[PDB]
Structures are given as structure tokens and as C-alpha cells.
């Protein structure tokens with residue numbers, strides 16, 4: 001069984017024994033004292049603790065292989081002229097097939113971000129959105145896959161105009177720096193300081209205007225937990241907490257030609273149940289029904305309004321507002337820098353395994 005073009009064969013069909021390709025394996029960086037952390041690669045104790053979690057790493061790898069094949073497919077057809085809805089539906093249809101969607105056991109970890117220009121994150125079109133991808137747009141494709149709640153959070157920036165090439169290079173270099181400097185016992189702020197230094201070393205010229213690339217200071221990388229996109233630890237992308245063994249990180253950076261600060265803008269499309277909210281009894285019929293739809297289909301995973309529409313749900317906006325007002329569900333509105341500014345993003349999921357650092361979502365693309 002080999003992959004077709006367009007991809008349609010599930011990843012678990014391409015690897016019947018359920019052993020999926022490893023990501024990029026990295027030796028841990030040397031500590032601030034000068035001593036190498038290379039011993040972990042050959043430590044018999046660390047090798048044992050690593051094989052104990054083999055099923056876990058293996059679920060991330062399946063989800064990461066689905067991510068590589070879905071993004072390679074998107075890159076071959078994403079073009080100006082397409083509506084944002086068309087782009088998201090074509091990507092998600094492929095993602096559902098390759099991950100072999102199965103309720104909460106395999107599926108889409110979160111909505112397809114396709115944030116444009118000054119908007120950096122958390123924009124996906126709602127029903128009726130007529131936005132069309134333009135030749136001069138700088139589009140952030142940020143989509144997720146999961147196997148048993150082992151989430152792949154991985155993203156890249158799409159452009160058609162070479163005027164953004166050095167802005168893309170700056171952010172790609174900064175993400176790769178963040179990835180290189182991450183490791184067991186490394187302070188989160190040290191990863192952030194390294195990201196910022198690389199980012200700000202770049203100057204770009206776009207349409208006769210020049211800018212020094214700014215990291216978006218209120219956007220950050222994060223630890224990932226089972227069915228939990230943000231497990232609680234923050235990886236700043238600017239200058240106390242340490243990364244720990246067995247942890248999973250989304251290393252992401254955003255570079256901007258604006259203020260380097262995002263604000264809540266436009267209408268909301270992304271929502272997610274607050275992970276720490278227990279069972280809340282609801283009597284309001286439409287609100288009760290919507291929370292049941294959310295619990296059954298998404299659990300603590302992020303969703304968007306288009307995903308409620310595809311489930312046959314209608315007249316749910318007040319119900320959704322009630323869930324947000326009760327603090328059961330949190331809205332995640334688009335995050336945008338100033339009008340006329342340009343933002344780019346690159347993101348990978350990394351596994352802090354006992355033996356090595358695995359950039360599980362690494363591809364031959366980025």
C-alpha cells in the first residue's frame with residue numbers, strides 16, 4: 001500500500017505494524033556551564049524510560065506524518081483566487097482522511113488557521129465569509145492533527161510575492177533557533193532570548209519601506225498535554241520555569257513589520273472548552289444541546305463555527321455566547337498587529353524524549 005496523488009490513503013494503512021517514521025532526532029544542547037548533555041543518547045536508564053513511552057511517541061509520529069503529507073498537498077494547490085473557506089475545507093478533507101478520523105481517538109486537533117497579513121493567528125473563516133486569498137497576501141497555515149490526544153501543532157507561512165522572502169527567512173531562522181536551544185532543564189526565558197536575538201538581526205524591505213523584524217511579544221510557544229493544546233508552560237519569543245524530561249513543546253515564533261504586539265480583532269471563529277472546568281449542569285435547552293455536541297465531538301480540543309455547521313447545528317450563536325459567559329468555553333478571536341503590517345509564522349512540535357530531542361513534525365520543507 002503506497003500513497004496516491006491527491007493523498008487519500010490513511011497513514012495507519014501505509015504503516016500496518018503501527019510503527020511510524022521518527023522526526024528529526026537531535027542531541028540535547030550543552031548546558032550554560034559548558035558540559036554536554038550527549039550522555040542521554042547512550043544512557044541505559046534513559047533508553048529504558050524512552051521505550052516505556054514508545055506508544056506515546058509513536059502516536060505523535062503518526063499524527064506528524066499525516067501533517068507532512070497534508071501540508072505538502074496544500075503547497076501544491078494553494079493559490080490566490082481561492083476563497084479562505086475553499087482552502088480550509090480542501091485541507092481539512094485531506095487531513096480527516098490521512099489521520100483516519102475516529103471521534104476523539106484520531107482527528108483534527110484544532111481549526112485550520114489561515115490568518116492574513118497583519119493578522120498573525122486564530123483566524124479561520126466562519127460561514128458566509130467571502131474573503132479571497134490575494135497575490136500580495138502573507139497567509140499563516142496553522143493546522144493540527146492528533147492520535148489519542150497526542151497533538152501535532154505545526155505551521156508555515158504561504159506567500160506568492162517574493163517581497164516577503166527575507167521576512168519568511170527571519171521567522172524560519174528564529175523558529176529553528178528556538179528549536180536548537182530547547183532542551184531538558186533549559187530555562188524557558190533563555191529559549192525566548194535566543195529567538196528574539198535571531199529575529200531582530202534581520203532587516204527587510206517591502207514596497208520601498210524598511211523594517212527591523214520584531215518578534216510578536218504577546219504570542220508564544222507552549223507545552224502540549226493530552227487533548228490539551230496549551231498545557232500551562234509558555235515559551236516566550238522575547239527576553240524562571242524550565243523544560244522537563246518527557247514534556248512536549250510547540251516551538252513557534254511570529255515576526256512582524258508592525259508594533260510586534262497583537263490585539264483581539266474581527267469576529268471570533270475559534271473556541272475551546274476550558275480544560276479545568278468540571279461538569280456544569282445546564283437546563284437552557286439550546287445551550288445544553290450545544291455543550292453536549294461540544295463534549296461528544298471535541299472534548300477539550302479546539303473547534304470553530306464551521307465545524308458546528310458541518311454537524312448540522314444552526315441557531316447556536318446565543319448558546320455559544322452563553323457557554324463563553326459561563327466560562328465553560330473560551331473564545332479565541334483573531335490576533336492582529338496594526339493595519340498595514342505583515343506577520344509570518346513557523347512552528348514545530350518537539351518531543352523532549354529521555355534520550356534525545358525529537359522535532360517530530362520536521363519535514364524536507366521546513
Ligand SMILES: NC(=O)c1[nH]c2ccc(Cl)cc2c1-c1ccccc1
Nearest residue numbers: 110222229230270271272302303332
Ligand atoms: N497554544 C496554541 O498555539 C493554541 N492553538 C489554538 C488553536 C485553537 C484554539 Cl481555540 C486555541 C489555541 C491555542 C491557545 C492559545 C492560548 C491559550 C490556550 C490555547
Ligand SMILES: [Mn+2]
Nearest residue numbers: 142153154155
Ligand atoms: Mn499552531
Ligand SMILES: [Mn+2]
Nearest residue numbers: 153250252347
Ligand atoms: Mn501553538
